[PDB]
Write a protein that binds this DNA or RNA. Structure first.
Ligand SMILES: [Mg+2]
Lengths: 62, 63, 126, 55, 76, 119, 189, 62
RNA sequence: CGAGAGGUACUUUUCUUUUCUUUCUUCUUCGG
């Protein structure tokens, strides 16, 4: 943006063109396109992590 | 039949280009070739004679 | 005991480098016998430049008092291998457990070597 | 599940936690996991000025 | 009895399976066993020593058959 | 068995000669004229190569010679290719500038037989 | 490779036979000792994996990483056959111990009556001794003239423990060496 | 469709000399070159996309 | 007991020597 003033528009960041599960993956343009599609879709929903800050008002199956 | 089906599962199911086809579809069209109808294509393949090679570049001129 | 003794001098290296971390197939033409030689020498352990001379002995034993399987300790590059091909301007084909040798010379200098025999390789850089 | 005494240990005494095969890298074509590891290593080791660091 | 002169593996695996079921049902072994309790180890020795009274009715596709013997056949 | 005898196809124009195409044919006869190298390359490729005058490098040169001697008749050049020049001359030549080599054929023996006579 | 799967979460279900007539004919026609020839192309069914293939390539193409006596006698504990001659008496004027080449370590898996010849990689085996090899592949992989197919054509009675001993000894040697992927392999300069 | 079919094959044989640069610049102790020459996992086409350039990217669908 | 959903599950599965050509401007051959 700095040297040519022929644009009249600019983006905030180039990494904001992806989803919330894909823009948090580091080096996402370095990996293969088939391998980031696994992590951003299937491996992000099956990864055990945080559940809830209140497990007393939650009676979910699992 | 097992030796053909094992080559049928371990084959590329994606076409190479728009003119050619996949190696799986090429095996399917060869194995299922007794449909006795379809698409009215009827591709032929003609050859050249032996006496056309007596001239300089005779095969290219004949073809 | 020794059936071959000559004074070799090298002329060519196959990688022709310093720190290739591989084996180097040398090319050594000999004086007063007109004999060519191929040999894989570990340069990183036993250094060999291009231009230096070295002797070479080839004895089937080492203890120099008979007993075919006190020792010869006047050399620095003692190896051991087998001769598997005498397919001849004769030429030998000796493999020292993976390192190949090709002793190609006149047919009268190399005639006492039999087939599928165990022989050593003695070398010293003068 | 290997014991701690059988792992290849670093000179600082740091044993690895999860050992993966090198053969999974040329087939799956995943570079950037090694880059993430080299970045997170350089973050966590001390410098013998921690500001202006590539985080 | 002029078909193959050699015992196939498919008939051998059935002869041994019949002999193991016979020995497992407390039958007298025709071969002298020397320190063995598995019926398959007795059945393989009986097959290799040719001391078993079985006959193979090798059926033909035309409708007839050729009744063979185990001792007439050979095992490699 | 003999070789072929029919040459290249003739080139017929759709108009008459305007006395400039003869000038172009005379000037372009100097270039693309490899008639001086075919008989030399055949004589060296028969000396250096066994089964002489029957290998493929002799048959292509024998075809190129028959195509090059018709260059005055029809307008088809020879086009001597690369990887066919010998780059080494035998003993029975007067080329004392090229890196020559001792000929082992009958031509080297006939060249040495006159040096044995003029001694 | 017969199962055409990997350790990936991929399940593998088994069937337990109950009668003895199904148990006798199970290890006589269906077991791995009977499924030695690949029925599709006539070659061998089992071959080397990836770690064993890489450690068999690296033990043959290096030819400069020599082993001593204490490493050779440690690696011989997984090999079925005996110890060869050392073939390196002195590699240096300061060498105080006989060393062992890499191709003599791979030659301890072959029987003494085994002969093998691959002309594309200059592989010459004579009297159970790997004598020559120079910058070649596909003689250790699956092919028409690999050494596993010739070992199956040789005896076909004691090859299932030769492949197991090779997978043990090459995994010990590759652990003694160490295979890794760093950023210098990605940089390629 | 035919001009792309005669150009994919014209790129894939001229890329064989571009793929031949991993043996000049790469060392003999490279793990990808070892795993590609051994035939265990991968080839030189994976190493070229890893290090130098991805190359031709085309699809067979219109 | 049937329907609807999401999930595990085909991973590279066939690129070939990595040594292939630029040191170029060089006698046409026979007989009058
Ligand atoms: Mg899996």
């Amino acid at each position: 943006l700095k040297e040519p003033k022929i644009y009249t528009h600019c983006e905030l960041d180039l990494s904001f063109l992806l989803g919330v599960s894909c823009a948090v993956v580091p080096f996402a343009n370095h990996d293969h396109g088939r391998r980031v599609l696994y992590q951003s879709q299937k491996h992000c929903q099956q990864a055990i992590g945080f559940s809830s800050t209140n497990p007393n008002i939650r009676c979910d199956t699992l | 039949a097992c030796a053909l089906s094992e080559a049928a599962y371990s084959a590329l199911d994606q076409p190479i280009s728009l003119l050619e086809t996949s190696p799986l579809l090429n095996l399917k069209n060869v194995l299922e070739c007794g449909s006795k109808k379809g698409q009215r294509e009827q591709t032929m393949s003609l050859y050249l004679s032996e006496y056309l090679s007596k001239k300089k570049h005779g095969f290219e001129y004949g073809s | 005991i020794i059936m071959f003794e000559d004074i070799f001098v090298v002329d060519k290296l196959d990688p022709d480098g310093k720190k290739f971390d591989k084996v180097t197939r040398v090319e050594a033409r000999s004086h007063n016998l007109e004999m060519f030689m191929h040999l894989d020498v570990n340069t990183e352990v036993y250094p060999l430049a291009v231009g230096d001379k070295f002797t070479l002995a080839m004895a089937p034993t080492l203890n120099l008092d008979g007993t075919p399987d006190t020792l010869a300790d006047k050399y620095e590059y003692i190896m051991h291998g087998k001769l598997y091909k005498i397919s001849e301007k004769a030429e030998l084909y000796v493999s020292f457990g993976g390192l190949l040798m090709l002793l190609q010379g006149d047919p009268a200098h190399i005639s006492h070597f039999e087939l599928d025999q165990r022989l050593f390789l003695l070398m010293r850089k003068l | 599940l290997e014991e701690q005494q059988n792992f290849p240990f670093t000179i600082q005494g740091i044993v690895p936690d999860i050992v993966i095969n090198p053969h999974a890298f040329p087939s799956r074509q995943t570079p950037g996991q090694l880059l993430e590891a080299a970045l997170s290593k350089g973050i966590a080791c001390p410098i013998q000025a921690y500001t202006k660091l590539t985080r | 009895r002029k078909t193959s002169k050699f015992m196939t593996k498919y008939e051998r695996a059935r002869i041994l399976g019949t002999r193991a079921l016979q020995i497992s049902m407390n039958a007298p072994v025709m071969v002298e066993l020397e320190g063995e309790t598995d019926p398959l180890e007795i059945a393989m020795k009986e097959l290799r020593q040719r001391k078993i009274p079985f006959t193979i009715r090798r059926y033909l596709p035309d409708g007839s058959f050729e009744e063979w013997g185990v001792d007439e056949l050979i095992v490699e | 068995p003999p070789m072929d005898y029919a040459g290249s196809r003739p080139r017929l124009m759709d108009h008459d000669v305007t006395l400039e195409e003869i000038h172009k044919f005379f000037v372009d006869y100097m270039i693309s004229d490899t008639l001086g190298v075919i008989s030399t390359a055949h004589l060296v490729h028969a000396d250096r190569d066994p089964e002489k005058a029957r290998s493929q490098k002799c048959l292509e040169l024998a075809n190129l010679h028959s195509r090059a001697v018709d260059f005055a008749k029809t307008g088809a050049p020879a086009e001597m290719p690369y990887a066919l020049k010998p780059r080494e001359f035998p003993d029975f030549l007067e080329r004392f500038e090229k890196p020559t080599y001792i000929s082992e054929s009958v031509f080297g023996k006939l060249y040495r037989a006159v040096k044995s006579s003029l001694a | 490779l017969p199962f055409r799967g990997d350790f990936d979460g991929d399940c593998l279900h088994g069937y337990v036979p109950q009668s003895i007539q199904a148990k006798v004919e199970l290890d006589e026609l269906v077991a791995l000792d009977k499924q030695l020839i690949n029925r599709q192309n006539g070659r061998n069914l089992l071959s080397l994996g990836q770690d064993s293939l890489t450690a068999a390539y690296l033990v043959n193409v290096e030819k400069n990483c020599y082993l001593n006596r204490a490493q050779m006698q440690q690696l011989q504990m997984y090999c079925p056959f005996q110890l060869p001659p050392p073939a390196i008496i002195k590699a240096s004027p300061s060498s105080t111990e006989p060393q062992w080449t890499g191709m003599q370590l791979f030659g301890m898996l072959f029987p003494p009556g085994f002969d093998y010849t691959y002309p594309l990689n200059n592989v010459v085996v004579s009297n159970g001794e790997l004598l020559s090899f120079s910058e070649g592949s596909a003689w250790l992989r699956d092919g028409e003239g690999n050494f596993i197919e010739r070992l199956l054509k040789h005896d076909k009675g004691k090859v299932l423990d030769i492949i197991y001993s090779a997978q043990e000894m090459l995994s010990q040697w590759l652990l003694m060496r160490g295979l890794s992927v760093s950023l210098a392999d990605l940089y390629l300069s | 469709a035919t001009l792309s079919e005669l150009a994919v094959s014209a790129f894939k044989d001229a890329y064989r000399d571009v793929q031949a640069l991993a043996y000049r610049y790469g060392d003999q102790s490279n793990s990808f070159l070892i795993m590609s020459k051994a035939g265990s996992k991968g080839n030189i086409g994976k190493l070229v996309q890893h290090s130098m350039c991805i190359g031709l990217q085309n699809s067979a669908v219109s």
